[PDB]
Every structure is written in C-alpha cells, then in structure tokens.
C-alpha cells in the first residue's frame, strides 16, 4: 500500500451534536515535530483558541510517539466543515485532511 | 479507514537502477487542481526540469480525473531520497510523501 509518511495515526472524520465536545488527534514517531491545524486552506486554528477550541501537544517516552490534539467544545453549527492537520520535522512535511459534522 | 483527501491515487515509493527512468504520479478528482513536486522539505522540482527530470499534467474527460506526472530519467545515485507531492484546489490542500531509491 501507500508510502509511510509522518502520520503514525492520521486525524479522522468526526461527528458531534450542537453543544457537544470532540477531540481530533495525530500521532507522529519521534526537536519535536511541529503541528498546525487549519479549517479550510488558510485559517490557522492556533489563532482561534478560546472557549470553543483548544490545542494540546504531548510526548510518550516509552513509545517515542508525539501526540497532537485539537479539542472542540460547545460545538456550533458553523464549525462543520473541512479541516487539515499539518506536521513538520527537520526533514519532512506532511498533512492530512478530515471533516467535522455538527448535528442539530 | 482514513478520511478521503484530494488524492484518488497517491504517489508511490519507487526503485530504479542507475541510468534508468521512472515515473511518479498522482490523480485528483475534478479550475484544475495545481501540483507541486518537492525533494525534501524545500526543493521545488519545477526548478530542476531538464535532462533528468520532467513534469506533465493532463486531464481525462470521461472519468473527470486530473493526472500529475513526475518523470525521472537517466537516474543518478544522488536522486535517491525523500520526495513530496503537494496539490491545491480552490478549497483544499493536500500532500503525499514517497521515496525514490536508485540502485547501483
């Protein structure tokens, strides 16, 4: 099958009900790789952190895996749409598309 | 499995003998999507077109698929390495990592 990129685990499509919370994540094998999350081509979600959105990055020493999380909270209908996770290392770039659907 | 991105067909890992030729390609469902090919993070292969490297983009009307090709010719040992295909549409971005190994 397909070449192995940077994503040990890609972000997945998700569904949430209005007012609900949902987490998206990515894992990258092990400087730390650096993540960016986007809605659409150009909206950098780091600029949107607040009551509805939070980011958290961590590292598991045993497995040598880096975890990147995107937390959506109190979901609103406008959050529905197309998202992208981008990761960079000293030597590579990769990215991964996924979708969020907000119901109700 | 994983969310559907822009790649109907991702570029694959390839192997070639020195002096050999090899083609890498990507397919994207249907302005045309626009491709960039890289070696490493930053070398834009459009700037390297010549006796060893050529690019060709086309469209199949029946299937509505766009094809992006990277042709490597008279392969040299230094061409071995990590490559990336990036594609953009009006609404999305995606990319795909792959490797070339030159033997002998």
Residue B63 sits in a domain whose CATH number is 2.60.40.10
Provide the β-strand partners of residue B17.
B103
Rounded to whole angstroms, what are the CA distances from B97 to A45, B27, B42, B82, B87?
A: 24, 14, 13, 7, 12
* Start-to-end CA span in chain A (Å): 38
Contact residues, chain B to chain A, C-beta under 8 Å = 2-6, 10-13, 40-41, 82, 84, 88, 91-99
CB A97 within 8 A of CB B88: no
The phi, psi pair for B48, rounded to 5°, reads: -120, 5
Quick one: closest CA in A to B88, which residue?
Answer: A41
Breaks (C-N over 2.5 A) in chain B follow: 30
Q: Please give the Cα distance from A48 to A53 (Å, whole number).
A: 7
Provide the β-strand partners of residue A96.
A85
- Which helix (H) or strand (E) is B6 found in, with range? none
**Resolution reading in Å:** 1.5
Q: Please give the Cα distance from A10 to A96 (Å, whole number).
A: 6
Determination technique for this PDB entry? Answer: X-ray
CB A36 within 8 A of CB A76: no
Q: Please give the Cα distance from A77 to A55 (Å, whole number).
A: 20
The domain in which residue B15 lies consists of: 1-104
What HEC string does chain A produce? CCCCCCCCECCCCEEEECCCCEEEEEEEECCCCEEEEEECCCEEHHHHCCCCEEEEEEEECCCCEEEEEEEECCCCHHHCEEEEEEEECCCCEEEEEEEEEEEC
Q: Please give the Cα distance from B97 to B77 (Å, whole number).
A: 20
Q: A35 CA to chain B: closest CA distance, Å?
A: 15
Quick one: closest CA in B to A96, which residue?
Answer: B94
Task: Answer whether A84 sits within 8 Å of B99, measured CB to CB.
Answer: no
Number of independent structural domains in chain B: 1
B54 labelled as ligand-binding?
Answer: yes
CB B67 within 8 A of CB B23: no
Taking alpha carbons only, the member of B46, B23, B33, B1 closest to residue B100 is: B23
Taking alpha carbons only, the member of B12, B5, B30, B4 closest to residue B69 is: B12
Which of A11, A94, A98 lies nearest to residue B97, judging by beta carbons?
Answer: A94
Q: B67-70 contacts: CB < 8 A, separation 24 or more?
A: B67/B25, B67/B26, B67/B27, B68/B25, B68/B26, B68/B27, B68/B28, B68/B35, B68/B37, B69/B23, B69/B24, B69/B25, B70/B11, B70/B23, B70/B24, B70/B25, B70/B37, B70/B45
Q: Please give the Cα distance from B48 to B76 (Å, whole number).
A: 14
Q: Please give the Cα distance from B82 to A93 (Å, whole number).
A: 10
Q: Please give the Cα distance from B63 to B46 (Å, whole number).
A: 27
* Chain A residues lying within 8 Å of B85, measured CB to CB: none
Supply A42's token pair: 């150009």
Residues contacting residue A94 through CB under 8 Å, at least 6 positions apart = A5, A6, A7, A86, A87, B84, B95, B97
């Amino acid at each position: 099958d397909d070449p192995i990129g940077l994503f040990v685990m890609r972000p997945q499509d998700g569904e949430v009900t209005v007012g609900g919370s949902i987490t998206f994540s990515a894992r990258v094998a092990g400087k730390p790789p650096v993540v960016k999350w986007f809605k659409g081509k150009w909206v950098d979600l780091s600029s949107k952190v607040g009551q509805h959105l939070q980011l958290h990055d961590s590292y598991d020493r045993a497995s040598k895996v880096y975890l990147f999380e995107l937390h959506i909270t109190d979901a609103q209908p406008a959050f529905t749409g197309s998202y992208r996770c981008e990761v960079s290392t000293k030597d590579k770039f990769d990215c991964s598309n996924f979708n969020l659907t907000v119901h109700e």
